[PDB]
Amino acid sequence: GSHMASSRQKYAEEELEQVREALRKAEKELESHSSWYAPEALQKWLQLTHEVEVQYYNIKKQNAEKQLLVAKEGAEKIKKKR
Amino acid sequence: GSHMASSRQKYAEEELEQVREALRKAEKELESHSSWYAPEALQKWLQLTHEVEVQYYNIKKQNAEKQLLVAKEGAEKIKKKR
């Protein structure tokens, strides 16, 4: 099998690790910076962070549950290995 | 107070929402694409996704608990409000 393939969606590692540091840095500096301005910005910031947080979460939850069922059926129909 | 401010770290919304769709898209296409190549790429992909997932998760957990304690102390010393 192809152990090395032309994976173009592997960009995910860049995206996720950078966003981990970028966004968590933003979070921490934002919660630090909030003391300078009106809390509405923090409300919005926290709303957006949490909105998207629950979004990715939910998306993969839904996908994962689907995958669990789909791949279970598929695996038991093909051959279920280990 | 300043309701509108020169928040430059507000890029976080772009970052998180794009990565939400980008990375979840990558995940789904990757788990779909994996059948074309060796599962090691999926192992690596899932390892990276989950690594970083638990990383940002943990970081903000750590920060959040610190924030809880720090801000508790601060708020009770300044004047805690609602």
């Binding site: 093909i78 | 190549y37 999926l42 638990v54």
Partner: peptide, 23 residues
């Protein structure tokens, strides 16, 4: 193991169980 962790493992194993590729 947290919700994401457990489902990571479960779904990853399941996905490859069907879509392993080089099975």
């Amino acid at each position: 193991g947290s919700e994401l962790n457990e489902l990571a493992e479960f779904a990853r194993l399941q996905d490859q169980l069907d879509h392993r590729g080089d099975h």
